[PDB]
Every structure is written in C-alpha cells, then in structure tokens.
Design a protein around this ligand. Structure first.
Ligand SMILES: [N+]
Ligand SMILES: [N+]
Length: 301
C-alpha cells in the first residue's frame, strides 16, 4: 500500500521525491541545477557517496535522452532512486528450516529486543512456531523484556543467569528448537559499541557455535538500525557488515523523521536486503519492505 505509506514519509518528502518538484520548476539542465540537487540530497541524509552516484547517473541519463527541461529529471530520478531500492527488495522467507535461525545484531539503544518481539508475534500470528533466545546475557532488562513477550504470547524463551555466555545460551536454544520442532528461532545479542572488537568477536563466536549444530545457521543475520539516527545508521551497518556479514536489515523510526533519505545510503552502500521498515511503534507498524510502494509514496504528486 503506497498510499498508506505517504503519511509516514511526509517529513522525508520535504526534500526527496515530491520535494524535488519545486527545485526543478522552470529550470534548465546545467551544472548549477545538479549542484542544487546535490545539496538537497545531502540535507536529506542520502550520504556523500550515494548522492554522487545519483547525480552521475542522472546527468548521463538526461544527456542520453536529450532532455531539455529540468522538470523531466523527475521521472529519471524516480527510476534511478527506485532502482537503488529495488536491488534490496527481497522479502525475508523463514519457511522450511528446523529451525530457521535469525541472529539479531545491532547496537544498544536501537530497539533490537522490541523488534524481536514484534517479529515473533507476527510469525506466530502467521501460524509458525517461534522460540526466542535471550543472548544479550549481561542486560537483565533485555532478558526480562524478551520474557514478557514470550509469557504473554506462549512463546518459549531460552535464557540463563545474568552474565552467562551468549554463545552457550544460543547453543542451548538451537538444541531446544530442534527438539521441539520449532519453525523460527530469533536470538537477541549484546550491543555495546564501547569495545568494538569484543562485540564482533562475541558475534563471531555465536556464529561458530551455531554452525556446529547446523551448517546453514544462522539463516539470517539481521541488523536493526534507527533511521532517525541519520549517518549513525550507516556507520553501524558498515561495522557489522564488514566484521560479521549481514543478510537483512530492519530500519525503524522512519515516520516523522526528515532523515528517511538514509534508506538510500544503506541500500546503495551495502546491497543487503531491507526486510522490514518501522513506520510507528505498534506491532502492525513494522511492515515488510516493498521498494516499489516506498518509491511510489515518496514520489507521489
Ligand atoms: N499467556
Ligand atoms: N547466508
């Protein structure tokens, strides 16, 4: 539903999508125009490298089509920015594994635990059996939050004492999931960026332990990032992807932020599928990402 998404993206539409119309009105296509467009893309948090790529491709496309009027750049931009998102438009498919293991990674303070609970409830409402692993083992509040989701939804939560070894919790959870014929296992993890090497080594150890039980696990390594944090979301994605290897992204807090343009930077810089976008705080506001809906909402005029 592109039309539902329009309200969520209003603040982002001030600079991107329909926000381009006033910039192009009555203008010719020249270096000054492309400089104005660069400024607007950057203020929208599209990022230096992705902005340069967009401008380069737009310039080449306009020249090849022999466009005269800047108004005609709008459709080329819609296509080119749409292609950026189309390259990461693969939905997450959790079917057919015993269990399908989602390792949730990211920094503290981006809502990883709440996102896990929302996804778990969604998979359960779809008829899948879910289990949760409380792998953020030194943060009692994170463990308790996961246990709240599990208790109210009759979803099992595997946890150990505060300070337990994360890899051992997740190992025990995979064993329990296999014993109990679970369809989907979602594992929380630590997120302290104070010691980056320690965090990445802990995640790598978790992955090695999983692989001993099922060489296909983890089936998804999902990053959660917060769109309202702007370029911090991009730097977080780079850290986890270069160190561990991501296979999916959930981007939260897109509603009301004018920094929604960061989705283009995340998509272009890393090429990792964007699985879900958050457009509100409720379970139902965590939506499967549809790049074409997103572009249509952004560029609606
Ligand atoms: N319950
Ligand atoms: N993978």
């Amino acid at each position: 539903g592109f039309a539902r998404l329009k309200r969520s993206l209003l603040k982002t539409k001030e600079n991107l999508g329909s926000g381009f119309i006033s910039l192009f009105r009555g203008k010719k296509i020249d270096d000054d125009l492309f400089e104005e467009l660069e400024e607007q893309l950057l203020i929208a948090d599209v990022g230096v490298e992705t902005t340069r790529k967009i401008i380069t491709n737009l310039t080449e496309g306009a020249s090849r089509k022999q466009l005269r009027d800047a108004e005609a750049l709008y459709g080329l931009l819609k296509e080119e920015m749409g292609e950026i998102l189309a390259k990461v438009d693969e939905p997450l498919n959790v079917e057919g594994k015993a269990p399908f293991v989602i390792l949730m990674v990211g920094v503290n303070g981006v809502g990883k635990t709440t996102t896990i609970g929302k996804l778990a409830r969604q998979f359960e409402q779809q008829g899948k059996s879910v289990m949760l692993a409380a792998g953020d083992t030194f943060r009692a509040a994170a463990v308790e939050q996961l246990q709240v989701w599990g208790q109210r939804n009759n979803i099992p939560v595997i946890a150990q004492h505060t300070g337990a070894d994360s890899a051992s919790v997740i190992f025990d959870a995979i064993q329990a999931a296999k014993a109990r014929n679970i369809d989907v296992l979602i594992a929380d993890t630590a997120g302290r960026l104070q010691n980056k090497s320690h965090l990445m080594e802990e995640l790598k150890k978790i992955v090695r332990v999983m692989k001993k039980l099922d060489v296909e696990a983890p089936h998804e390594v999902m990053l959660t990032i917060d769109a309202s944090t702007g370029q911090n979301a991009v730097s977080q994605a780079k850290l986890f992807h270069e160190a561990v290897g991501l296979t999916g992204i959930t981007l939260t807090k897109l509603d009301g932020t004018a920094k929604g343009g960061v989705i283009f930077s995340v998509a272009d810089q890393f090429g990792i599928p964007i699985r879900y976008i958050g457009v509100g705080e409720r379970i139902e506001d965590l939506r499967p990402f549809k790049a074409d809906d997103f572009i249509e909402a952004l560029f609606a005029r």
